[PDB]
Amino acid sequence: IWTEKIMKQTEVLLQPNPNARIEEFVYEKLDRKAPSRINNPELLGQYMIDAGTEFGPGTAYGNALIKCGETQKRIGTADRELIQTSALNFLTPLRNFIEGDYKT
Amino acid sequence: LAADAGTFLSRAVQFTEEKLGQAEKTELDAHLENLLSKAECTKIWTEKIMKQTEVLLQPNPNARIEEFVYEKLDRKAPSRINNPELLGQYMIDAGTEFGPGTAYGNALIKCGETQKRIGTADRELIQTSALNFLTPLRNFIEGDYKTIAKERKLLQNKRLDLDAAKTRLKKAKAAETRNSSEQELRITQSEFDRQAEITRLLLEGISSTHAHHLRCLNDFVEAQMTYYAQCYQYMLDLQKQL
Amino acid sequence: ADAGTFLSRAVQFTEEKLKTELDAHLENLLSKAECTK
Amino acid sequence: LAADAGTFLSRAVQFTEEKLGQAEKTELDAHLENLLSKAECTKIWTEKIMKQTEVLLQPNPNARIEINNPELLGQYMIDAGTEFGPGTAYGNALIKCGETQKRIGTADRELIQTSALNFLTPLRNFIEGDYKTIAKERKLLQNKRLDLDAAKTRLKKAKAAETRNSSEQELRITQSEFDRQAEITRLLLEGISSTHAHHLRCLNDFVEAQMTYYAQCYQYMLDLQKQL
């Protein structure tokens, strides 16, 4: 009981958006790869960078916008890395146990 | 009062003929054209960043929809515990059930605490950012932009009148009527010029807007720094105990 | 025109919604197993 | 599963392009086209004739959905005759006329049974069988044609030679199924020829039924005249 609760909530913590999970479930049943959606940080970075470019790269405001966009994209990548590691060395074993030994 | 309807009629017919391409448009001064264009672009991007920021802060869209409903319903949206703190609660309860003496119990309970601390830190960032960033910008978009929009319409209307008068003079034959039209043309031109200055004056204020926003961005940054810094320290502490 | 671009976007989404072929022997076996189940 | 949805998407998109006229439409062979048209016409006309025949035999719509008018009139006449006095000449005539009116009603019921089972039934059977079966195959033939045209569109849009070669194979697959379905529908269309000959024999039966009805009714009226 406890193992199941923790395994689920921690997955929620990793993927906050419910619609995304629903899409994953559908694509899992569809047996087809779900599109590689861009995460919030990178998208925000893109918006900031493009906006800064439009206002003028030389301008201090533009410079800041571009810099922040770059950092934001870096953060997004790091986040993706974190998500991959957790599901590979944490969620996996627990799921294994609940799905195999428990049946026996 | 009926004369006003005639003015609305005149502005319309002219707008149609100009759209018909039969009539041309008196181009505005390049400076004002430039000023208006800059103000617009600014608003467009500022709006986009504000929205994407919000999404970043509150990932759950359904929650945002519920807030909108209660906002329109003029009711309070029930508060909810964030994912980090919730996980902590489940973990702590588990640890307790498995037995505090057991190392597994010790670890689970210890972690649940760190998670709740982290959740608290998260809410701090959300409030700090909202207070220091989103609002300042929102203000600008809701107030100054609106005013400028109104003035833009006034000048646009005046131009319509001017163009209509021109067209009327173009098709003026009777000397006396043509002279009256000349007086009418002078009349509209003056009013058009007056509004143009009014508009340019207001547009001048946009220059400071960029500087004001820059400060807000610097603040947001400081907030993120604060959030991660706290969380990092919290994590370190947890590993030491475990 | 604009309709064509909208159709292109629709097709892209269809692609969003929707391979090393294994040796025949294995494939045939896989099909057999599935049919049996 | 997902395959079902995918197939539908391809067919509809190609069809819309052809409807818009931007995309060309692969046509069918004249022989198959002629056969399909003949079958459609047969069902349309046969349907109308059978329905009107029902109205003619049973004018009452409610009765058609389900005592006949002649027999009801006969009842009224006989009752009146008794009240007016059976011995009275007026009473005598009313009673005799009512009886004959009921006999005519009986013959009408026989005609309805005889005709419907020898004329309406066969016409209905053809529409329920030959036409429907053809329509099902005709629909699948249109689906196969859409698949073929979609393959041709994919082929023309397959700039890559290897992709075009794959589209050629796909086109061949669609063509084979398309041609197969055409032949299946064609066989059903050939059956319509026999349907016409069968229908002709049924028409003759309906004619015979009407003649018997009129002949019997005439004799009944003759007898009443003599008695009165």
Residue numbers in the entry:
A (entry chain F): 54 to 157
B (entry chain E): 11 to 252
C (entry chain H): 13 to 30, 35 to 53
D (entry chain D): 11 to 76, 91 to 252
What does the paper say about this structure?
BAR protein endophilin B1 plays a key role in multiple cellular processes critical for oncogenesis, including autophagy and apoptosis. Endophilins are a highly conserved group of N-BAR proteins that contain an N-terminal amphipathic helix (H0) and a 20-residue amphipathic insert in helix 1 (H1i). These two motifs contribute to membrane association. BAR proteins are typically dimers in solution, where the dimer consists of three α-helices from each monomer that form a 6-helix bundle with a characteristic crescent shape.
Our EM structure of the endophilin B1 lipoprotein complex consists of six endophilin B1 dimers bound in two distinct conformations to a single artificial lipid platform. The final volume consisted of six endophilin B1 dimers and had a nominal resolution of 3.88 Å. Strong density could be observed for four dimers and slightly weaker density for two additional dimers. The volume contains a membrane bilayer density with anchored amphipathic helices. Interestingly, at higher contour levels the density corresponding to the membrane bilayer disappears, and where we expect to observe density corresponding to MSP2N2 scaffolds, there is none. Instead, we observe density that belongs to endophilin B1 amphipathic helices. Dimers bound to the surface of the bilayer and dimers that straddle the edges of the bicelle have distinct amphipathic helix conformations. The local resolution of the BAR domains is higher than that of the inserted amphipathic helices, suggesting the protein is flexible at the protein-lipid interface. Interestingly, no density corresponding to the SH3 domain-linker region is visible in any of our maps, either near the concave surface or proximal to the lateral part of the BAR domain.
